[PDB]
Amino acid sequence: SNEFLMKIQTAISSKNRYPKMAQIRGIEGEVLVSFTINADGSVTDIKVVKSNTTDILNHAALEAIKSAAHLFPKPEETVHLKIPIAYSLKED
């Protein structure tokens, strides 16, 4: 299995914003977001590919990547990445 990626998925979720009515009306889901880390240590090029959930959450999941960017590992070259981002009314 992976390692460091599980822990940034946490730091991203800790910066990620969920709306004040969403738990009350039962809203959840998973957003697919494509991006890259540079070998220079910065994060760029964040774009949403797919979602099963609110387009208001899709706008928040993409920003959460930039918002946790100082926690991230360094690649050996600037390749590509394509990552799913999750929400829950469950504590997580």
Domain layout of the chain by residue ranges: 1-92
Task: Find out whether 87 and 51 touch, Cβ atoms under 8 Å.
Answer: no
Q: What is the radius of gyration, based on Cα positions, of the chain?
A: 13
Residue 37, token pair as written in the block: 């880390």
Task: Find out whether 44 and 36 touch, Cβ atoms under 8 Å.
Answer: yes
Q: How many CB atoms lie within 10 A of CB 46?
A: 16
SS (H, E, C) 5-27: HHHHHHHHHHHCCCCCCHHHHCC
Task: Find out whether 34 and 50 touch, Cβ atoms under 8 Å.
Answer: no
Q: Is 76 helix (H, G, I), strand (E, B) or coil?
A: coil
- Start-to-end CA distance of the chain, whole Å, equals 20
Three-point CA angle 43, 44, 50, nearest 5°: 110
Q: How many CB atoms lie within 10 A of CB 89?
A: 13
Beta-carbon contacts of residue 53 (< 8 Å; ≥ 6 apart): 27, 28, 29, 30, 31, 87
The span from the CA of 24 to the CA of 9, in Å, is: 24
Q: Which of these, 47, 34, 43, lies nearest to 80 by C-alpha position?
A: 34
